[PDB]
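Run Protein disulfide-isomerase through structure prediction, thanks.
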Amino acid sequence: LVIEFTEQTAPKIFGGEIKTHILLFLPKSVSDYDGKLSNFKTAAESFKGKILFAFIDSDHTDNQRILEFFGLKKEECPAVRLITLEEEMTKYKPESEELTAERITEFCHRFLEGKIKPHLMSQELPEDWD
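Sure, done. The structure for Protein disulfide-isomerase is below.
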């Protein structure tokens, strides 16, 4: 499954058992939105129970704190960031901006294989997110 990450769903997303998340920041106005989402959903199927797939509508005004927290501006999306919470917060970036199921899947495999450069996030999780 792929869930929508909003402020309303953030607790449900970080308050779970899985502590690896991939986040697709996808402007709802992007060309072929359903296409990009489908690709992300297809990729999700390969990582059930290992990586939780979530998407953020980066166009949505109430998602501004979420954007800012993960270091992104609206004009920089669509973008993917993989986050680990076991146990200091760490952010990982794909090699390419390409958002195909194959490239998202490879990103995730590379991360599991320990191939991706880590980037500590020094901000504490918002109180709201649990």
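DSSP finds four helices and six strands in the chain.
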